Amino acid sequence: APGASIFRCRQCGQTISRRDWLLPMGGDHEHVVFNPAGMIFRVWCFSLAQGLRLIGAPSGEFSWFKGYDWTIALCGQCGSHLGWHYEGGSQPQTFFGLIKDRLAEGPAD
Ligand SMILES: O=C1CC[C@H](N2C(=O)c3ccccc3C2=O)C(=O)N1
Ligand SMILES: [Zn+2]
Numbered sequence: 001a002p003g004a005s006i007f008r009c010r011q012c013g014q015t016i017s018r019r020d021w022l023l024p025m026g027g028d029h030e031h032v033v034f035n036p037a038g039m040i041f042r043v044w045c046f047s048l049a050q051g052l053r054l055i056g057a058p059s060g061e062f063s064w065f066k067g068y069d070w071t072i073a074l075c076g077q078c079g080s081h082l083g084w085h086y087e088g089g090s091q092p093q094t095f096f097g098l099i100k101d102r103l104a105e106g107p108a109d
Contacts, residue, residue, distance in 0.1 A: 005108040007098070014051040014077035016103060023047040023095050025065060031097065033064045043083065043097040051076045052096075054085050064097070065089065073098070 007017045022029040023045040031043045043064070053076040058069035067089035073082050073096060083098035 001107065003107045004105055007103040007105050009051070009075040009078060009080055009082065010102055010104045011080045012075060012078040013104070014075050015109065016051050016075070016082065017046045017049040017096065017098065018108075019105070021046045021048045023092070025095065030100075031064060036062060041083075042100045044100045044103075046096045046098055047092065049073070049085075049096040049098065052082060052085070053079075058087055060088075068095075070097075 005019055006015065008015055025045045029045050031045065033043055034040045052073040054071045054073055056071055058071050060069040063070055065086055068086040069088040070084040070086050073085050074080065075082050080102060082102050083096060085096050087094045
């Protein structure tokens, strides 16, 4: 009965990722960053995620992770902005950076 197992959208409960899938990018799964609009995000890196909808084509502009280009990742169910999918880089080629406070963590399905 683990209670710290899967991550769902906080707004609607769509299944999104798992604690087992946390990915330590440059030594830490947690990256605290800010965008050009000055919004600060506590980004957790995950090797994998599901239930999102990747919007548009990738961009390298302002990327927080050197070598990676990003696409906005919305909750596929409700449209909540959950984070970004990163691609085009190395080791790994791809991963998700998800905004921690926009997810709810709980027991497995
Ligand atoms: O790695 C990333 C992902 C995208 C993120 N980002 C944003 O959140 C944003 C909001 C408004 C205008 C431009 C941006 C942008 O590049 C950002 O700054 N870096
Ligand atoms: Zn949602």
